[PDB]
Write a protein that binds this ligand. Structure first.
Ligand SMILES: O=c1[nH]c(=O)c2nn[nH]c2[nH]1
Ligand SMILES: O=c1[nH]c(=O)c2nn[nH]c2[nH]1
Ligand SMILES: O=c1[nH]c(=O)c2nn[nH]c2[nH]1
Ligand SMILES: O=c1[nH]c(=O)c2nn[nH]c2[nH]1
Ligand SMILES: [Ar]
Ligand SMILES: [Ar]
Ligand SMILES: [Ar]
Ligand SMILES: [Ar]
Ligand SMILES: [Ar]
Ligand SMILES: [Ar]
Ligand SMILES: [Ar]
Ligand SMILES: [Ar]
Ligand code: NA
Ligand code: NA
Ligand code: NA
Ligand code: NA
Lengths: 295, 295, 295, 295
């Protein structure tokens, strides 16, 4: 036997950081969950009980906290790049660092219409994420994403003209509910190293803001022919607005809301134009995926 | 043997309802999860296989959908009262209906600064809940609550002057992080029946709004001596603002954020006044509970 | 305003303990999650920022670990009694300790048909639990439970002769699937203190084993008329087998498995006697509860 | 813009099937969760609102139930192959079917030492899984796995001789707890189509049984130098025992159990040789991955 592939490190490292402006009193908080997995000349740790090649996962955890102490943790694309670059530069035998960051929302509270200097609310479990792959000799590959953005529209969704055969029961509809959890990923041009990442820093927050705004506006305004057709419009708009993105990927559940026929009870009319009460379906769910690039 | 207590019915009934203003085009959505459990002269279903006394849980589910079709589903205090009253009035042998409703957030989207007529976002997993106990001859007992309201303040939290003995390691602090998930419950005066509930309908949304506003403002503005002292201030303010509430109950985790001593690494200073990077603790957690009434 | 009720302490305290027989080499592991909440003369911590009455939740956590070091952690009824008794005896102003323990399964591995001396498997997420309420002057109230015991029978379940009215669509059946997650609780006679608990120690493991055996055998062998009728048989048998139990409580979901009519496709027969493929329903679920005592 | 990649279908399809031997009365149950995603000439559904190319996700769901009715659902490698082959053969424009199956445990109950004919227990949340990729012109690629197999050993785990630098605090140890959740995957030789899969059917259950037995025996018996060294031994043994497997992959968390120094309290000794009470750590966790092939 032989090792064909190997990576190891520390997962689920919870990190908080505070910035304190001691001139204004304004405090800003950041909270994330970090995973760092390393690759390199480590096969002997598996094959020969050779722990000399192991940078302990416990040491990787310490390094995450130290790096957060020594650097801004925002945007997460930059933090992940600094952290990944540390491992491949520090250790001659480590050749790749794979950094995943989940950013948790701490939105400043408005109290009596004024932003509070040091109080925050988790406005929803929506995440901003990065996957930063730092590969010696191959630069820095960044995928940025938003996930767990849960939305619903009560009309201006349609689904008709689909294939109908002996497996088909689904009625065509010209007016349905559409609800999803948005998972949207934008894949950056390869960066040569930390300098090139730093040269583009403002684009990270700006492209995340664009991706979110385009997702919400397209969802709300598209008289949707399908999940497929609506998600493609989101992707093409995001590509049009940031030349440093190569691809946009959407992964969208179709979280079904079924009509309830109540006509068996006192002739109640609750279908078609009279549909008011629906049964949200926990499972199963449509799952629709696209990766869109430049033609 | 004998039945000392019995209740049964349907749990986890997911319900959606849409209101459509066909004059303005504005659509409004409501989504909840409903549980209805019945009590009454039902012991023989347990003791003698006597299913004649069982209103099938499947029929309870149908009744939830029918009631939602025939009535507004807001405020949940009213909906729960209508639903509970249905079972004790319809069935001579059913003497109590216990209705629990969890209300899910669907907040109207703002697109280009304008409220969208039919698109919504789940802004966080915060819930508004009711427990409505409709008991034949004993009226309607309502407990209203907000839950899963997750907040953090980065300073203006203290914890000192606690008991110190041979079991104590905790350092006193005059400046710490405080984070919790707010579970706040207000218990209404007993109502005689549906008419009395209906006579107070506006107070339900108003008292929920008060409970939330008081929670957020007190949390943000109290230079906290403890979770105990801060939560008591929230309760006393809510009681002062609604005479139809008898008690306010808070159940608050203390979601700890630990300092990380980094002085072992290049003399890094990350404690006390220099604390920037913290380790959020998933478990264990302080758990602090109060029920506050009028003196 | 005034404090009507108050309790506080530490939740979600994960504890592991190992016993090592250094004569046989056999090691035995225990893992639990502990919650301790205290009551007593603590209202001033809420009303006057008086932290002098607070035994810090951090100190409660330390005390859990110290108590586990100084005592066996099995059976959990005894451990919870020792832990609760510590707080009301140690602190003059603490008058109640409420101890909840969840016991996690670590079942010894059988390797090549021989029990391994120090390797364990989590055979399912089934829990053994206790709630121990130690109240100064009122002794020790223990509720023992098993929970998350997930079972299914593919036949010998029936449901007919239930109430049928204008809310009813459910077809009577003489042959259905029955599946549940068993939550069974047995409530002990009040104990005067730790000595009386210790005098009954063997009964705790024996009564848990009885409750589990009776649950499984009754579920498997009862040609069930309803969840109600089957659960009552379990309760009456457990009461018959342990005179120191006062009540037995079951809380059982009816985890529905729906027939799928496939007759629309090539006349496939998949209902009634021909039913082979079913759709497990995640929600909603029947929820059936009983408390059974001696007549 | 252009579609670079696209797949869609139905996720989270819960399926139950019963087999009834009407000669012996013995009933056997199967429960799974199925996902089917299709690829093919479907880009116009995204780009031009062309629903004619869409086999509705609802129809994919119907097809899963119909296929389960018409075929055995075991082993899952065969069921997934039949299901995937259906879509690429039935639809000229569908060129790939990606079938993921999670198999849920329903283990026959033993009542009074006799196997019960129709009663089952979920002995733990351990899963048996398949990923079956059926690609027109490229045959059938199967990855088999077991997941959520949670184990602990209380000794005969070591971790020393790892890299020590200015980022390192971890003490070397010659005796620690090792606990993990086993995720093990074996990747089959490419199969030309359904006939070749069928020709190997007995090997699926046999190789799953081998993978589980080798995992448990190696974990229990290896005086472990690291997670790396132990998992490699499992992989090399599984490869040695089934020539139709090309690779074995393990993904293992190191679920840490920390010593608790209690020497601050009455000089209690709970470290090193005296360590009895430990603090299970929910997060962070080491994460160790290998893919092993033939040299
Ligand atoms: O088995 C282990 N492998 C590692 O890579 C590691 N790092 N810290 N502890 C560890 N234990
Ligand atoms: O066993 C059952 N009990 C009930 O009360 C019920 N209601 N619907 N189905 C049911 N099954
Ligand atoms: O606010 C707090 N209340 C307490 O009771 C406590 N105990 N430890 N830390 C604490 N913080
Ligand atoms: O938007 C949709 N896309 C689909 O592919 C689909 N299939 N069923 N319903 C559907 N809705
Ligand atoms: Ar952070
Ligand atoms: Ar969409
Ligand atoms: Ar609703
Ligand atoms: Ar608070
Ligand atoms: Ar334990
Ligand atoms: Ar039952
Ligand atoms: Ar199945
Ligand atoms: Ar291992
Ligand atoms: Na390197
Ligand atoms: Na009645
Ligand atoms: Na006392
Ligand atoms: Na095809």
């Amino acid at each position: 036997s032989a090792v064909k592939a190997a990576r190891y490190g520390k997962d689920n490292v919870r990190v908080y950081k505070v910035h304190k402006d001691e001139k204004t009193g304004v405090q800003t908080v950041y909270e994330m969950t970090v995973c760092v997995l390393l690759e390199g000349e480590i096969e002997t740790s598996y094959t020969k009980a050779d722990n000399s090649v192991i940078v302990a996962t416990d040491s990787i955890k310490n390094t995450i906290y130290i790096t957060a102490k020594q650097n801004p943790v925002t945007p997460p694309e930059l933090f992940g790049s600094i952290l990944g670059t540390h491992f491949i530069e520090k250790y001659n035998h480590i050749h790749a660092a794979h950094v995943n960051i989940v950013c948790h929302r701490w939105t400043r509270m408005d109290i009596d219409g004024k932003p509070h200097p040091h109080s925050f609310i988790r406005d929803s479990e929506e995440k901003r994420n990065v996957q930063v792959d730092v590969v010696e000799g191959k630069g820095i590959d960044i995928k940025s994403s938003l996930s767990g953005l849960t939305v619903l529209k009560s009309t201006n969704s349609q689904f008709w003209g689909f294939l109908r055969d002996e497996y088909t029961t689904l009625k065509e509809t010209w007016d349905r509910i559409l609800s999803t959890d948005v998972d949207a990923t934008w894949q950056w041009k390869n960066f040569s190293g930390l300098q090139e990442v730093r040269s583009h820093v403002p684009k990270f927050d700006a492209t995340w803001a664009t991706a979110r705004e385009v997702t919400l506006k397209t969802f709300a305004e598209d008289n949707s022919a399908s999940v497929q057709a609506t998600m493609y419009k989101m992707a093409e708009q995001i590509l049009a607005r940031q030349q440093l993105i190569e691809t946009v990927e959407y992964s969208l559940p179709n979280k079904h809301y079924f009509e309830i026929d109540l006509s068996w009870h006192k002739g109640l009319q609750n279908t078609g134009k009279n549909a008011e009460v629906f049964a949200p379906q926990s499972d199963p769910n449509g799952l629709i995926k696209c990766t869109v690039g430049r033609s």
